[PDB]
Write a protein that binds this ligand. Structure first.
Ligand SMILES: CC1(C)C[C@@](C)(c2cc(Cl)c(O)cc2O)Oc2cc(O)c(Cl)cc21
Ligand SMILES: O=C(O)CCC(=O)C(=O)O
Ligand SMILES: [Fe+2]
Length: 432
């Protein structure tokens, strides 16, 4: 028999107390009516503007459209990878259309509240037994807003292990967050035996384990729960659907290191340091052909192409919908990437040079081969996603573009989109 515990069960309380002291529930009544009102109409304002989208992700070779629709809000220039998809933040105001702007400021306000609340709970957790690590682990820099109308799903998956009923989101961890960082969730739903099917819950279980009954926490309008310290790492959680639509705001400390606009612009500039930068034209000449430098260049070339450009454009107009913040950055990154395409072309030219000693030539190939191989394989992978049957089902404002894509016989680009011949020839030379 698959069982779980809820507040109806005598044992729930001791189970929570003893086995989940890093899980906190602050009920709606602990949060002012003022914040509740401001936050709930911010959700509606964003929903009404169509700012939340389902994502067409890629998982285990499978293109899947997420049941839940979402928008990422947070520090300007920050991003968050979620199921191999890089989400780009709609900026909130610290250091557009008035309404959407206002909403973002609201979610920042909520962020401030939750943050303080989290530090407090971390400090009490510490009192049950530096301060820098506490503030570091509650410094939320993004929220991922989620929405689902359980009515639009024709059939929801049964919870596999504990008989928890229908799932909106099955078991997982929140990934790519700062080590041991808290996660804080504001939950907003409208309105014998086991959990009430009509009510939203969050479910928790320990990783690896389906023998300890899972916990299902009911979540009524405006309840907040917090996952503290290592909880998110040691436990899985899921979201159990009720009968009515529900939003949530999930505040996180995203690991914002190789995932910011400042970082990737810096990487680009680093690559371009190998380029004679007098004038911007098709005559790209390189300062050095030292293995280590050419490798770095080609790696950055792949980084901006696949982690940034292709991720951003995969979503169609999913970002210009509610902000134009990323317009100039993406135009600038693409112009940066286009120069780097000139860089690969010049490298290929150097390699082909008849005066080049074979030893130096081979040392260059060994430097760049893995990068160009990855670039080939990754392109094939991306082009396929853009052409999948599920991708073509999407609406016009969402349908994936495979930007940047060029047909060949497009004299504007120095190299072909399809690198298989070039790769095969490079690899063939190194076997001479
Ligand atoms: C991958 C899988 C099947 C499992 C699960 C539980 C999931 C979510 C997240 Cl966020 C995670 O980091 C890891 C996970 O296993 O939930 C979703 C939700 C979705 O919308 C889609 Cl398309 C796929 C999935
Ligand atoms: O909505 C919640 O309570 C958790 C968030 C979540 O599971 C998600 O959509 O990633
Ligand atoms: Fe989650």
């Amino acid at each position: 028999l698959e069982s779980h515990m809820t507040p109806k069960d005598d044992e729930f309380y001791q189970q929570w107390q003893l086995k989940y002291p890093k899980l906190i529930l602050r009920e709606a009544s602990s949060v002012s009516e003022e914040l509740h009102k401001e936050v709930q109409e911010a959700f509606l304002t964003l929903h009404k503007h169509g700012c939340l989208f389902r994502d067409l992700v890629r998982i285990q070779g499978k293109d899947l459209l997420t049941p839940v629709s979402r928008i990422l809000i947070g520090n300007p220039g920050c991003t968050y990878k979620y199921l191999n998809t890089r989400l780009f933040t709609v900026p909130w105001p610290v250091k557009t259309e008035a309404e959407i702007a206002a909403a973002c400021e609201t979610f920042l306000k909520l962020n401030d509240y939750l943050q303080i609340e989290t530090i407090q709970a971390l400090e009490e957790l510490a009192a049950k037994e530096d301060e820098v690590d506490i503030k570091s682990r509650a410094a939320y820099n993004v929220t991922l807003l989620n929405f689902m109308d359980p009515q639009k799903m024709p059939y929801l998956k049964e919870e596999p292990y504990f008989g928890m009923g229908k799932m909106a989101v099955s078991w997982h961890h929140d990934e790519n967050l700062v080590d041991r960082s808290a996660v804080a969730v504001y939950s907003y739903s409208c309105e014998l035996e086991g959990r009430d099917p009509d009510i939203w819950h969050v479910g928790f279980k320990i990783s690896w384990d389906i023998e300890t009954p899972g916990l299902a926490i009911p979540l009524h309008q405006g309840d907040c729960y917090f996952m503290l310290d290592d909880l998110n790492a040691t436990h899985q959680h899921c979201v159990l659907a009720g009968s009515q639509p529900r939003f949530s705001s999930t505040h996180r400390v995203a690991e914002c290191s190789t995932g910011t606009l400042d970082y990737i612009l810096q990487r680009c500039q680093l690559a371009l340091q190998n380029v004679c930068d007098d004038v911007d034209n098709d005559d790209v000449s390189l300062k050095s052909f030292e293995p280590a430098v050419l490798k770095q260049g080609e790696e950055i070339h792949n980084e901006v192409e696949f982690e940034w450009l292709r991720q951003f454009w995969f979503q169609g107009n999913r970002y210009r919908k509610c902000t134009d913040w990323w317009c100039q950055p993406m135009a600038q990154l693409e112009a940066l990437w286009k120069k780097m395409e000139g860089v690969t072309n010049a490298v290929l030219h150097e390699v082909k040079r008849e005066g080049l000693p074979v030893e130096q030539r081979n040392e260059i190939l060994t430097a760049i081969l893995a990068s160009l191989t990855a670039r080939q394989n990754l392109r094939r992978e991306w082009h396929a996603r853009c052409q999948s049957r599920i991708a073509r089902t999407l609406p016009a404002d969402q349908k994936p573009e495979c930007r940047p894509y060029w047909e060949k016989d497009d004299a504007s680009m120095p190299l072909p989109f399809d690198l298989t011949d070039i790769v095969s020839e490079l690899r063939g030379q190194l076997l001479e």
